[PDB]
């Protein structure tokens, strides 16, 4: 229930080894020329798989 000892800096950092921020899955627009999330509508131009989806 209670820690018998305080943890050292080394022990704490060893546990935190596996803490990381996930990289987003980014695809390039071959025509538009910008970044967007793969399998997601490109919000700059509204196109998805070569077809207009969201009309600005």
């Amino acid at each position: 229930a209670h820690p018998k000892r305080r943890q050292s800096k080394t022990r704490t950092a060893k546990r935190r080894t596996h803490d990381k921020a996930v990289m987003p899955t980014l695809a390039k627009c071959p025509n538009c020329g910008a970044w967007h999330i793969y399998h997601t509508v490109c919000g700059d131009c509204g196109y998805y798989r070569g077809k207009l989806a969201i009309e600005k």
Binding site: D19, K20, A21, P24, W35
Partner: protein
């Protein structure tokens, strides 16, 4: 005269460093360090895309900081950066001052709450 000479030397050194700073951001330094470690060393435009689409909250502020650092590079070089020419050469997150608050606990006890802040520094340089 000694302090004047030292200040002149430091000012001359500053002219060849391209950096921006964010100070006193009211947000956990340990949480900001995740994003910093994610984007350390990346090409600048790819890093801008990563920060734009990241699922962490701190990326919104880091994106503005990186844009400001790129603008400082452009001003100190008196030109514009070409595509794929700059990269994130240095980035660190430091702990800042903490706000202390009290939250009531059962049976009359009271506990301290720490609202932490952070500083971020970004350098940019050419892929040499």
């Amino acid at each position: 005269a000694r302090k004047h000479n030292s200040a002149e030397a430091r000012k001359e050194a500053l002219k060849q460093m391209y950096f921006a700073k964010l100070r006193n951001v009211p947000t956990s330094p340990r949480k900001m360090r995740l994003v910093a470690d994610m984007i350390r060393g990346m090409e600048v435009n790819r890093a801008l895309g990563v920060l734009k689409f990241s699922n962490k909250e701190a990326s919104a502020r880091v994106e503005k900081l990186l844009r400001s650092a790129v603008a400082n590079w452009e001003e100190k070089n008196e030109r514009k950066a070409e595509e794929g020419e700059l990269f994130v050469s240095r980035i660190c997150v430091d702990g800042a001052s903490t706000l202390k608050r009290l939250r009531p606990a059962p049976q009359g006890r009271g506990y301290r709450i720490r609202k932490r802040s952070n500083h971020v520094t970004i350098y940019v340089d050419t892929l040499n």
